[PDB]
Amino acid sequence: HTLVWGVWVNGVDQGDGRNIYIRSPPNNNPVKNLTSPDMTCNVDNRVVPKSVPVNAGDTLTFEWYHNTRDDDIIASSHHGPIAVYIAPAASNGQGNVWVKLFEDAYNVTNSTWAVDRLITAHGQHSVVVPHVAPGDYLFRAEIIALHEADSLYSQNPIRGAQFYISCAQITINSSDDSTPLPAGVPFPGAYTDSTPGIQFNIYTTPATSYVAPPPSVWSGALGGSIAQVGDASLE
Ligand SMILES: OC[C@H]1O[C@@H](O[C@H]2[C@H](O)[C@@H](O)[C@H](O[C@H]3[C@H](O)[C@@H](O)[C@H](O)O[C@@H]3CO)O[C@@H]2CO)[C@H](O)[C@@H](O)[C@@H]1O
Ligand SMILES: [Cl-]
Ligand SMILES: [Cu+2]
């Protein structure tokens, strides 16, 4: 149970984005139905009044929280991966539009899931803004909590993989467009009951065997991190 509070751009806090530049849902409950329209941008997908200006190559940091800013972030039980996707905003997230910029699942070196490291990072994970066409975009940050993912939601709707989905409105101003954005995958649609990484038993199956759901990270993607960029306590 987690939500995005706002974003940072090059370590500069853009301020509380909830219902402002984040298409915030009404609460932190997960999406679990893989064929739900709610898989696009969570249960209240609509245009919000602001879009955060960035340039290609900026560090864009998403900041999550549980109940209040810079708290426990997400229950520690919620082990799983983190991904970020991008789509042109005029799509409203519909159709074959979502391109993956970032994946972090289980780090064998550290013996930790992405969610574990997100807690340590005070809810902060970042991407490099890619060199796509200037314009308005949706950045779809997705945490998958796997603590009930041994079941398919379609078999037992009390369980299933849990999707914490947050769409941020980002405007890319300065970009050379050296990596034009291709078509991508649909949400809902990209994840199905047979997709690797959707049904996974963290109690019985080693995390060293976990394969995150496709698609693969796009060749145009410039990377990211799970790390505290900004100190909310200094404000
Ligand atoms: O026992 C089932 C699993 O529970 C997990 O805790 C979640 C609770 O089930 C859920 O009721 C609670 O929801 C809170 C939410 O956290 C809070 O922010 C909001 O204000 O109110 C909701 C209640 O209406 O969320 C927790 C997760 O934080 C356990 O984490 C899990 O191990 C356990 O299997
Ligand atoms: Cl839960
Ligand atoms: Cu939860």
Coordinates of N, CA and C and ligand atoms in Angstrom, one line a residue:
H1 N 0.9 -1.2 0.0 CA 0.0 0.0 0.0 C 0.9 1.2 0.0
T2 N 1.0 1.9 -1.2 CA 2.0 3.0 -1.4 C 1.5 3.9 -2.5
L3 N 1.9 5.1 -2.5 CA 1.5 6.2 -3.5 C 2.7 7.0 -3.8
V4 N 2.6 7.8 -4.9 CA 3.7 8.8 -5.2 C 3.3 10.1 -4.6
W5 N 4.2 10.7 -3.9 CA 3.9 12.1 -3.3 C 4.3 13.2 -4.3
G6 N 5.4 13.0 -5.0 CA 5.8 14.0 -6.0 C 7.1 13.5 -6.7
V7 N 7.7 14.4 -7.4 CA 9.0 14.0 -8.1 C 10.0 15.1 -7.8
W8 N 11.3 14.7 -8.0 CA 12.4 15.6 -8.0 C 13.0 15.6 -9.4
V9 N 13.6 16.8 -9.8 CA 14.3 16.9 -11.1 C 15.7 17.4 -10.8
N10 N 16.7 16.6 -11.1 CA 18.1 17.0 -10.8 C 18.2 17.3 -9.3
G11 N 17.6 16.5 -8.4 CA 17.7 16.7 -7.0 C 17.0 18.0 -6.4
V12 N 16.1 18.5 -7.2 CA 15.2 19.7 -6.8 C 13.8 19.2 -6.7
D13 N 13.3 19.3 -5.5 CA 11.9 18.8 -5.2 C 10.9 19.6 -6.0
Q14 N 10.0 19.0 -6.7 CA 9.0 19.8 -7.5 C 7.8 20.0 -6.6
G15 N 7.8 19.5 -5.4 CA 6.7 19.8 -4.4 C 5.6 18.7 -4.6
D16 N 4.6 18.8 -3.7 CA 3.5 17.9 -3.6 C 2.8 17.8 -4.9
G17 N 2.8 16.7 -5.6 CA 2.2 16.5 -6.9 C 0.8 15.8 -6.9
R18 N 0.3 15.5 -5.7 CA -0.9 14.6 -5.6 C -2.1 15.4 -6.2
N19 N -2.7 14.8 -7.2 CA -3.9 15.4 -7.9 C -3.5 16.7 -8.6
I20 N -2.2 16.9 -8.8 CA -1.7 18.2 -9.4 C -0.9 17.8 -10.7
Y21 N 0.2 17.1 -10.5 CA 0.9 16.6 -11.7 C 1.0 15.0 -11.7
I22 N 0.5 14.4 -10.6 CA 0.3 12.9 -10.5 C -1.1 12.6 -10.7
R23 N -1.5 11.6 -11.5 CA -2.9 11.2 -11.6 C -3.2 10.3 -10.5
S24 N -3.3 10.9 -9.3 CA -3.4 10.1 -8.0 C -4.7 9.4 -8.0
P25 N -4.7 8.1 -7.6 CA -5.9 7.4 -7.2 C -6.4 7.9 -5.9
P26 N -7.6 7.5 -5.4 CA -8.2 7.9 -4.2 C -7.5 7.4 -2.9
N27 N -6.8 6.3 -3.1 CA -6.2 5.6 -1.9 C -5.0 4.7 -2.4
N28 N -4.3 4.2 -1.5 CA -3.1 3.4 -1.8 C -3.4 1.9 -2.0
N29 N -4.6 1.5 -2.3 CA -4.9 0.0 -2.5 C -4.3 -0.4 -3.8
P30 N -3.9 -1.7 -3.9 CA -3.4 -2.1 -5.2 C -4.4 -2.4 -6.3
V31 N -3.9 -2.4 -7.5 CA -4.6 -2.9 -8.7 C -4.2 -4.4 -8.8
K32 N -5.1 -5.3 -9.0 CA -4.7 -6.7 -9.1 C -5.3 -7.4 -10.4
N33 N -6.4 -6.9 -10.9 CA -7.0 -7.5 -12.1 C -6.2 -7.2 -13.4
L34 N -5.5 -8.2 -14.0 CA -4.6 -7.9 -15.1 C -5.4 -7.3 -16.3
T35 N -6.6 -7.6 -16.5 CA -7.4 -7.1 -17.7 C -8.1 -5.8 -17.3
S36 N -8.0 -5.2 -16.1 CA -8.7 -4.0 -15.7 C -8.2 -2.8 -16.5
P37 N -9.1 -1.9 -16.9 CA -8.7 -0.6 -17.3 C -7.8 0.1 -16.3
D38 N -7.9 -0.3 -15.0 CA -7.2 0.3 -13.9 C -5.7 0.0 -14.0
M39 N -5.3 -1.0 -14.9 CA -3.9 -1.3 -15.0 C -3.1 -0.1 -15.8
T40 N -3.8 0.8 -16.5 CA -3.1 1.8 -17.3 C -2.4 2.7 -16.3
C41 N -3.2 3.5 -15.5 CA -2.7 4.5 -14.7 C -3.5 4.5 -13.3
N42 N -3.9 3.3 -12.9 CA -4.6 3.2 -11.6 C -6.0 3.7 -11.8
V43 N -6.8 3.7 -10.7 CA -8.3 3.7 -10.8 C -8.8 5.1 -11.2
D44 N -8.1 6.2 -11.1 CA -8.6 7.5 -11.5 C -7.6 8.2 -12.5
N45 N -7.6 7.6 -13.7 CA -6.8 8.1 -14.8 C -7.6 9.2 -15.5
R46 N -7.1 10.4 -15.3 CA -7.6 11.6 -16.0 C -6.5 12.6 -16.1
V47 N -6.7 13.6 -16.9 CA -5.7 14.7 -17.0 C -5.7 15.6 -15.8
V48 N -4.6 15.8 -15.1 CA -4.5 16.7 -13.9 C -3.8 18.0 -14.4
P49 N -4.0 19.1 -13.6 CA -3.7 20.4 -14.2 C -2.3 20.8 -14.5
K50 N -1.3 20.1 -14.0 CA 0.1 20.4 -14.2 C 0.9 19.3 -14.8
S51 N 2.0 19.6 -15.5 CA 3.0 18.7 -16.1 C 4.3 19.2 -15.8
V52 N 5.2 18.4 -15.2 CA 6.5 18.9 -14.7 C 7.5 19.0 -15.8
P53 N 8.1 20.2 -16.0 CA 9.1 20.4 -17.1 C 10.4 19.7 -16.8
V54 N 10.9 19.0 -17.8 CA 12.3 18.4 -17.7 C 12.9 18.5 -19.1
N55 N 14.2 18.3 -19.1 CA 15.0 18.1 -20.4 C 15.5 16.7 -20.5
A56 N 15.8 16.2 -21.7 CA 16.5 15.0 -21.9 C 17.8 15.0 -21.1
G57 N 18.1 13.9 -20.3 CA 19.3 13.7 -19.5 C 19.1 14.2 -18.1
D58 N 18.0 14.8 -17.8 CA 17.7 15.1 -16.3 C 17.5 13.8 -15.6
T59 N 17.8 13.9 -14.3 CA 17.5 12.8 -13.3 C 16.1 13.1 -12.8
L60 N 15.2 12.2 -13.1 CA 13.8 12.3 -12.6 C 13.6 11.3 -11.5
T61 N 13.3 11.7 -10.3 CA 13.2 10.9 -9.1 C 11.7 10.8 -8.7
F62 N 11.1 9.7 -8.6 CA 9.8 9.4 -8.1 C 9.9 9.2 -6.6
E63 N 9.0 9.8 -5.8 CA 9.1 9.7 -4.3 C 7.8 9.1 -3.8
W64 N 7.8 7.9 -3.3 CA 6.7 7.1 -2.8 C 6.5 7.3 -1.3
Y65 N 5.4 7.0 -0.7 CA 5.1 7.1 0.7 C 3.9 6.2 1.0
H66 N 3.7 5.9 2.3 CA 2.6 4.9 2.6 C 1.4 5.7 3.1
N67 N 1.5 6.4 4.3 CA 0.4 7.2 4.8 C 0.8 8.6 4.9
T68 N 2.0 9.0 5.3 CA 2.5 10.4 5.3 C 3.9 10.4 4.6
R69 N 4.3 11.6 4.2 CA 5.6 11.7 3.5 C 6.7 11.1 4.3
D70 N 7.6 10.4 3.6 CA 8.9 10.0 4.2 C 8.7 9.2 5.4
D71 N 7.7 8.3 5.4 CA 7.4 7.3 6.5 C 8.0 6.0 6.2
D72 N 7.3 4.9 6.5 CA 7.8 3.6 6.2 C 7.8 3.2 4.7
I73 N 7.1 4.0 3.9 CA 7.1 3.9 2.4 C 6.2 2.9 1.9
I74 N 6.4 1.6 2.3 CA 5.6 0.5 1.9 C 5.9 -0.6 2.9
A75 N 4.9 -1.4 3.2 CA 5.1 -2.5 4.2 C 6.3 -3.4 3.7
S76 N 7.2 -3.8 4.6 CA 8.4 -4.6 4.2 C 8.0 -5.9 3.6
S77 N 6.8 -6.4 3.9 CA 6.3 -7.7 3.4 C 6.2 -7.7 1.9
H78 N 6.1 -6.5 1.3 CA 5.7 -6.3 -0.1 C 6.8 -6.4 -1.1
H79 N 7.7 -7.5 -0.9 CA 8.9 -7.7 -1.7 C 8.4 -7.8 -3.2
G80 N 9.2 -7.2 -4.1 CA 9.0 -7.4 -5.5 C 9.8 -6.3 -6.3
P81 N 9.6 -6.3 -7.6 CA 10.3 -5.4 -8.5 C 9.7 -4.1 -8.7
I82 N 10.5 -3.2 -9.4 CA 10.1 -1.8 -9.7 C 10.4 -1.7 -11.2
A83 N 9.4 -1.1 -11.9 CA 9.6 -0.7 -13.4 C 9.1 0.7 -13.6
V84 N 9.6 1.4 -14.6 CA 9.1 2.7 -15.1 C 8.9 2.6 -16.6
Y85 N 7.7 3.0 -17.0 CA 7.4 3.0 -18.5 C 7.1 4.5 -18.8
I86 N 7.2 4.7 -20.1 CA 6.9 6.0 -20.7 C 5.9 5.8 -21.9
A87 N 5.0 6.8 -22.1 CA 4.0 6.8 -23.2 C 3.8 8.3 -23.6
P88 N 3.5 8.6 -24.8 CA 3.1 9.9 -25.2 C 1.8 10.3 -24.5
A89 N 1.6 11.5 -24.0 CA 0.5 11.8 -23.2 C -0.8 11.8 -24.0
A90 N -0.7 12.1 -25.3 CA -2.0 12.2 -26.1 C -2.6 10.8 -26.2
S91 N -1.9 9.8 -26.0 CA -2.5 8.4 -25.9 C -3.4 8.2 -24.7
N92 N -3.2 9.0 -23.7 CA -3.9 8.7 -22.4 C -3.6 7.3 -21.9
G93 N -2.5 6.8 -22.3 CA -2.1 5.4 -21.9 C -2.7 4.3 -22.6
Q94 N -3.6 4.6 -23.6 CA -4.3 3.6 -24.4 C -3.5 3.1 -25.6
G95 N -3.7 1.9 -26.0 CA -3.0 1.3 -27.1 C -1.6 0.8 -26.8
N96 N -0.9 0.5 -27.9 CA 0.5 -0.2 -27.8 C 1.5 0.9 -27.7
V97 N 1.6 1.5 -26.5 CA 2.3 2.8 -26.3 C 3.3 2.8 -25.1
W98 N 3.3 1.7 -24.3 CA 4.2 1.9 -23.1 C 5.6 1.3 -23.3
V99 N 6.6 2.1 -23.2 CA 8.0 1.7 -23.4 C 8.7 1.6 -22.1
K100 N 9.4 0.5 -21.8 CA 10.0 0.4 -20.5 C 11.4 1.1 -20.4
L101 N 11.5 2.0 -19.5 CA 12.8 2.7 -19.2 C 13.6 2.1 -18.1
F102 N 13.1 1.3 -17.3 CA 13.8 0.8 -16.0 C 13.2 -0.5 -15.5
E103 N 14.0 -1.4 -15.1 CA 13.6 -2.6 -14.3 C 14.7 -2.8 -13.2
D104 N 14.2 -3.2 -12.1 CA 15.0 -3.7 -11.0 C 14.2 -4.7 -10.3
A105 N 14.6 -5.9 -10.2 CA 13.8 -7.0 -9.6 C 14.5 -7.5 -8.3
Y106 N 15.3 -8.5 -8.4 CA 16.1 -9.0 -7.2 C 17.6 -8.9 -7.5
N107 N 18.3 -8.2 -6.6 CA 19.7 -8.0 -6.8 C 20.4 -9.1 -6.1
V108 N 21.1 -9.9 -6.9 CA 21.8 -11.1 -6.3 C 23.0 -10.6 -5.5
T109 N 23.7 -9.6 -6.0 CA 24.9 -9.1 -5.3 C 24.5 -8.7 -3.8
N110 N 23.4 -7.9 -3.7 CA 23.0 -7.3 -2.4 C 22.0 -8.2 -1.6
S111 N 21.5 -9.3 -2.3 CA 20.5 -10.2 -1.7 C 19.2 -9.4 -1.3
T112 N 18.8 -8.4 -2.2 CA 17.6 -7.6 -1.9 C 16.8 -7.4 -3.1
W113 N 15.5 -7.3 -2.8 CA 14.5 -6.9 -3.8 C 14.5 -5.4 -4.0
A114 N 14.1 -4.9 -5.1 CA 13.9 -3.5 -5.4 C 13.1 -2.8 -4.3
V115 N 12.0 -3.4 -3.9 CA 11.1 -2.7 -2.9 C 11.9 -2.6 -1.6
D116 N 12.7 -3.6 -1.2 CA 13.5 -3.5 0.0 C 14.4 -2.2 -0.1
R117 N 15.1 -2.0 -1.2 CA 16.0 -0.9 -1.4 C 15.2 0.4 -1.5
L118 N 14.0 0.4 -2.0 CA 13.2 1.6 -2.1 C 12.9 2.1 -0.7
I119 N 12.6 1.2 0.2 CA 12.4 1.6 1.6 C 13.6 2.3 2.2
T120 N 14.8 1.7 2.0 CA 16.1 2.3 2.4 C 16.3 3.6 1.8
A121 N 15.8 3.8 0.6 CA 16.0 5.1 -0.2 C 14.9 6.1 0.1
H122 N 14.2 6.0 1.2 CA 13.1 6.9 1.6 C 12.1 7.1 0.5
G123 N 11.8 6.0 -0.3 CA 10.8 6.0 -1.3 C 11.3 6.5 -2.6
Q124 N 12.6 6.7 -2.9 CA 13.0 7.4 -4.1 C 13.7 6.4 -5.0
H125 N 13.2 6.5 -6.3 CA 13.9 5.8 -7.4 C 13.9 6.7 -8.6
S126 N 14.9 6.6 -9.4 CA 15.1 7.6 -10.5 C 15.3 7.0 -11.9
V127 N 15.0 7.8 -12.9 CA 15.4 7.4 -14.3 C 16.1 8.6 -14.9
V128 N 16.9 8.4 -15.9 CA 17.4 9.5 -16.8 C 16.3 9.8 -17.8
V129 N 15.9 11.0 -18.0 CA 14.9 11.3 -19.0 C 15.5 11.0 -20.4
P130 N 14.8 10.2 -21.2 CA 15.4 9.8 -22.5 C 15.3 10.9 -23.6
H131 N 16.1 10.7 -24.7 CA 16.2 11.7 -25.7 C 15.1 11.4 -26.7
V132 N 13.9 11.5 -26.3 CA 12.7 11.3 -27.2 C 12.2 12.7 -27.7
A133 N 11.2 12.7 -28.5 CA 10.7 14.0 -29.1 C 10.2 14.9 -28.0
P134 N 10.5 16.2 -28.0 CA 9.9 17.1 -27.1 C 8.3 16.9 -27.1
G135 N 7.8 17.1 -25.9 CA 6.3 17.0 -25.8 C 5.9 16.5 -24.5
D136 N 4.6 16.2 -24.4 CA 4.0 15.7 -23.1 C 4.0 14.2 -23.1
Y137 N 4.4 13.7 -21.9 CA 4.5 12.3 -21.7 C 3.8 11.9 -20.3
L138 N 3.5 10.6 -20.3 CA 3.1 10.0 -19.0 C 4.3 9.1 -18.6
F139 N 4.8 9.2 -17.4 CA 5.8 8.3 -16.8 C 5.0 7.4 -15.8
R140 N 4.9 6.1 -16.1 CA 4.1 5.1 -15.3 C 5.1 4.4 -14.4
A141 N 5.1 4.7 -13.2 CA 6.0 3.9 -12.2 C 5.1 2.8 -11.7
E142 N 5.7 1.6 -11.6 CA 5.0 0.4 -11.2 C 5.8 -0.4 -10.2
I143 N 5.3 -0.6 -9.0 CA 5.8 -1.5 -8.0 C 4.9 -2.7 -8.1
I144 N 5.5 -3.9 -8.2 CA 4.7 -5.2 -8.0 C 5.1 -5.8 -6.7
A145 N 4.1 -5.9 -5.8 CA 4.3 -6.6 -4.5 C 3.9 -8.1 -4.8
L146 N 4.8 -9.0 -4.4 CA 4.7 -10.4 -4.7 C 4.3 -11.2 -3.5
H147 N 4.1 -10.7 -2.3 CA 3.9 -11.5 -1.1 C 2.6 -12.4 -1.2
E148 N 1.7 -12.2 -2.1 CA 0.5 -13.1 -2.3 C 0.4 -13.5 -3.8
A149 N 1.5 -13.5 -4.5 CA 1.6 -13.8 -5.9 C 1.7 -15.3 -6.2
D150 N 1.7 -16.2 -5.2 CA 1.7 -17.6 -5.5 C 0.4 -18.0 -6.2
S151 N -0.7 -17.3 -5.9 CA -2.0 -17.4 -6.6 C -2.0 -16.4 -7.7
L152 N -2.8 -16.8 -8.8 CA -3.3 -15.9 -9.7 C -4.5 -15.2 -9.1
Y153 N -4.6 -13.9 -9.3 CA -5.9 -13.1 -8.9 C -7.1 -13.7 -9.6
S154 N -6.9 -14.2 -10.8 CA -8.0 -14.8 -11.6 C -8.5 -16.2 -11.0
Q155 N -7.7 -16.8 -10.2 CA -8.0 -18.0 -9.4 C -8.6 -17.7 -8.0
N156 N -8.0 -16.7 -7.4 CA -8.4 -16.3 -6.0 C -8.2 -14.8 -5.8
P157 N -9.3 -14.1 -6.0 CA -9.2 -12.6 -6.0 C -8.8 -12.0 -4.7
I158 N -8.7 -12.8 -3.6 CA -8.2 -12.2 -2.4 C -6.7 -12.1 -2.5
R159 N -6.0 -12.9 -3.4 CA -4.6 -12.9 -3.5 C -4.1 -12.4 -4.9
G160 N -2.9 -12.7 -5.3 CA -2.4 -12.2 -6.6 C -1.3 -11.2 -6.4
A161 N -0.5 -11.1 -7.4 CA 0.4 -10.0 -7.6 C -0.4 -8.7 -7.4
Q162 N 0.3 -7.7 -6.7 CA -0.3 -6.4 -6.4 C 0.5 -5.3 -7.2
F163 N -0.3 -4.5 -8.0 CA 0.4 -3.4 -8.8 C 0.1 -2.1 -8.2
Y164 N 1.1 -1.4 -7.7 CA 1.0 0.0 -7.3 C 1.5 0.8 -8.4
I165 N 0.6 1.5 -9.1 CA 0.8 2.1 -10.4 C 0.6 3.6 -10.2
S166 N 1.5 4.4 -10.7 CA 1.4 5.9 -10.6 C 1.8 6.5 -11.8
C167 N 1.0 7.3 -12.5 CA 1.3 8.1 -13.7 C 1.6 9.5 -13.4
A168 N 2.8 10.0 -13.7 CA 3.2 11.4 -13.6 C 3.2 12.0 -15.0
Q169 N 2.7 13.3 -15.0 CA 2.6 14.1 -16.2 C 3.9 14.9 -16.3
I170 N 4.7 14.5 -17.3 CA 6.1 15.1 -17.5 C 6.1 15.8 -18.9
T171 N 6.6 17.0 -19.0 CA 6.8 17.6 -20.3 C 8.3 17.7 -20.6
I172 N 8.7 17.1 -21.7 CA 10.1 17.1 -22.1 C 10.2 18.3 -23.1
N173 N 11.0 19.3 -22.6 CA 11.3 20.5 -23.4 C 12.5 20.4 -24.3
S174 N 13.7 20.4 -23.7 CA 14.9 20.3 -24.6 C 15.2 18.8 -24.8
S175 N 15.2 18.3 -26.0 CA 15.6 17.0 -26.4 C 16.0 17.0 -27.8
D176 N 17.2 16.4 -28.1 CA 17.7 16.2 -29.5 C 16.9 15.1 -30.2
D177 N 16.1 14.3 -29.5 CA 15.4 13.2 -30.2 C 16.3 12.2 -30.9
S178 N 17.4 12.0 -30.3 CA 18.4 11.0 -30.8 C 17.9 9.6 -30.7
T179 N 16.9 9.3 -29.8 CA 16.3 8.0 -29.7 C 14.8 8.1 -29.7
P180 N 14.2 8.2 -30.9 CA 12.7 8.4 -31.1 C 12.0 7.3 -30.3
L181 N 10.9 7.6 -29.7 CA 10.2 6.6 -28.9 C 9.5 5.7 -29.9
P182 N 9.6 4.3 -29.8 CA 8.9 3.4 -30.6 C 7.5 3.1 -30.0
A183 N 6.7 2.3 -30.8 CA 5.5 1.7 -30.2 C 6.0 0.9 -29.0
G184 N 5.0 0.7 -28.1 CA 5.3 -0.2 -26.9 C 4.2 -1.1 -26.7
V185 N 4.0 -1.5 -25.4 CA 3.0 -2.5 -25.0 C 1.7 -1.8 -24.5
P186 N 0.6 -2.6 -24.4 CA -0.6 -2.0 -23.8 C -0.7 -2.4 -22.3
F187 N -1.2 -1.5 -21.5 CA -1.7 -1.8 -20.2 C -3.1 -1.3 -20.1
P188 N -4.1 -2.2 -19.8 CA -4.0 -3.6 -19.6 C -3.6 -4.3 -20.9
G189 N -3.0 -5.5 -20.8 CA -2.8 -6.4 -21.9 C -1.4 -7.0 -21.9
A190 N -0.4 -6.3 -21.5 CA 1.0 -6.8 -21.6 C 1.2 -7.9 -20.6
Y191 N 0.6 -7.8 -19.4 CA 0.7 -8.9 -18.4 C -0.5 -9.7 -18.4
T192 N -0.3 -11.0 -18.5 CA -1.4 -12.0 -18.5 C -1.0 -13.1 -17.5
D193 N -2.0 -14.0 -17.2 CA -1.8 -15.1 -16.2 C -0.6 -16.0 -16.5
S194 N -0.1 -16.1 -17.8 CA 1.0 -16.9 -18.2 C 2.4 -16.1 -18.3
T195 N 2.3 -14.8 -18.1 CA 3.5 -13.9 -18.2 C 4.5 -14.3 -17.1
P196 N 5.8 -14.5 -17.4 CA 6.8 -14.7 -16.4 C 6.7 -13.5 -15.3
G197 N 6.8 -13.9 -14.1 CA 7.0 -12.9 -13.0 C 5.7 -12.5 -12.4
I198 N 4.6 -12.9 -12.9 CA 3.2 -12.5 -12.4 C 2.8 -13.5 -11.3
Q199 N 2.9 -14.8 -11.6 CA 2.6 -15.8 -10.6 C 4.0 -16.3 -10.1
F200 N 4.3 -16.0 -8.8 CA 5.6 -16.3 -8.2 C 5.4 -16.5 -6.7
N201 N 5.9 -17.6 -6.2 CA 5.8 -17.9 -4.8 C 7.1 -17.6 -4.1
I202 N 7.1 -16.4 -3.4 CA 8.4 -16.0 -2.7 C 8.7 -16.9 -1.5
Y203 N 7.8 -17.7 -1.0 CA 8.0 -18.5 0.2 C 8.7 -19.8 -0.3
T204 N 8.4 -20.3 -1.5 CA 9.0 -21.6 -2.0 C 10.0 -21.4 -3.1
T205 N 9.9 -20.3 -3.9 CA 10.8 -20.2 -5.1 C 11.8 -19.2 -4.8
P206 N 13.1 -19.6 -5.0 CA 14.2 -18.6 -4.7 C 14.1 -17.4 -5.5
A207 N 14.4 -16.2 -4.9 CA 14.3 -14.9 -5.6 C 15.4 -14.9 -6.7
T208 N 16.5 -15.7 -6.6 CA 17.5 -15.8 -7.6 C 17.0 -16.4 -8.9
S209 N 15.8 -17.0 -8.9 CA 15.1 -17.6 -10.1 C 14.1 -16.6 -10.6
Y210 N 13.8 -15.5 -10.0 CA 12.7 -14.6 -10.4 C 13.1 -13.9 -11.7
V211 N 12.2 -14.0 -12.7 CA 12.2 -13.3 -14.0 C 11.1 -12.2 -14.0
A212 N 11.5 -11.0 -14.1 CA 10.5 -9.9 -14.1 C 9.7 -10.0 -15.4
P213 N 8.4 -9.5 -15.3 CA 7.6 -9.6 -16.5 C 8.2 -8.8 -17.6
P214 N 8.2 -9.3 -18.9 CA 8.5 -8.5 -20.0 C 7.5 -7.4 -20.1
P215 N 7.7 -6.3 -21.0 CA 8.8 -6.3 -21.9 C 10.2 -6.0 -21.4
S216 N 11.2 -6.3 -22.1 CA 12.6 -5.8 -21.8 C 12.7 -4.3 -21.8
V217 N 13.7 -3.8 -21.1 CA 14.0 -2.4 -21.1 C 14.4 -2.0 -22.5
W218 N 13.9 -0.9 -23.0 CA 14.2 -0.3 -24.3 C 15.6 0.0 -24.5
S219 N 16.2 -0.3 -25.7 CA 17.5 0.1 -26.1 C 17.8 1.6 -25.9
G220 N 16.8 2.5 -26.0 CA 17.0 3.9 -25.8 C 17.1 4.4 -24.4
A221 N 16.8 3.5 -23.5 CA 16.8 3.9 -22.0 C 18.2 4.2 -21.6
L222 N 18.3 5.2 -20.7 CA 19.6 5.7 -20.2 C 20.0 5.2 -18.8
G223 N 19.1 4.5 -18.1 CA 19.4 4.0 -16.8 C 18.6 4.7 -15.7
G224 N 19.0 4.3 -14.5 CA 18.3 4.8 -13.3 C 19.0 4.3 -12.1
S225 N 18.3 4.5 -10.9 CA 18.8 4.1 -9.6 C 17.6 3.9 -8.7
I226 N 17.9 3.2 -7.6 CA 17.0 3.2 -6.4 C 17.9 3.7 -5.2
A227 N 17.7 5.0 -4.9 CA 18.6 5.7 -4.0 C 18.0 7.1 -3.6
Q228 N 18.3 7.5 -2.4 CA 17.7 8.8 -2.0 C 18.5 9.9 -2.7
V229 N 17.8 10.8 -3.4 CA 18.4 11.9 -4.2 C 18.2 13.2 -3.4
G230 N 17.1 13.2 -2.7 CA 16.8 14.4 -2.0 C 16.3 14.1 -0.6
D231 N 16.6 15.1 0.3 CA 16.3 14.9 1.7 C 15.1 15.7 2.1
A232 N 13.9 15.0 2.2 CA 12.6 15.7 2.4 C 12.7 16.4 3.8
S233 N 13.5 15.8 4.8 CA 13.6 16.3 6.2 C 14.2 17.7 6.2
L234 N 14.9 18.1 5.2 CA 15.6 19.5 5.2 C 14.5 20.6 4.9
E235 N 13.3 20.2 4.4 CA 12.3 21.2 4.0 C 11.6 21.7 5.2
Ligands
LIG1 O1 -2.8 -10.0 6.3 C1 -2.8 -9.6 4.9 C2 -1.5 -8.8 4.6 O2 -1.7 -7.5 5.3 C3 -0.6 -6.6 4.9 O3 -1.0 -5.4 5.5 C4 -1.9 -4.5 4.7 C5 -3.3 -4.7 5.2 O4 -3.9 -5.9 4.8 C6 -4.2 -3.6 4.7 O5 -5.4 -3.7 5.4 C7 -3.5 -2.2 5.0 O6 -4.3 -1.2 4.5 C8 -4.3 0.1 5.1 C9 -3.2 0.9 4.5 O7 -1.9 0.4 4.8 C10 -3.3 2.3 5.1 O8 -2.3 3.1 4.5 C11 -4.7 2.9 4.8 O9 -4.8 4.2 5.4 O10 -5.7 2.0 5.4 C12 -5.6 0.7 4.9 C13 -6.7 -0.1 5.6 O11 -8.0 0.4 5.2 O12 -2.3 -2.2 4.4 C14 -1.3 -3.1 4.9 C15 0.0 -2.9 4.2 O13 0.5 -1.6 4.6 C16 0.7 -7.1 5.4 O14 1.7 -6.3 5.0 C17 1.0 -8.5 4.8 O15 2.2 -9.1 5.3 C18 -0.2 -9.4 5.1 O16 0.1 -10.7 4.5
CL2 CL -1.5 -6.5 1.3
CU3 CU -0.1 -3.2 0.6

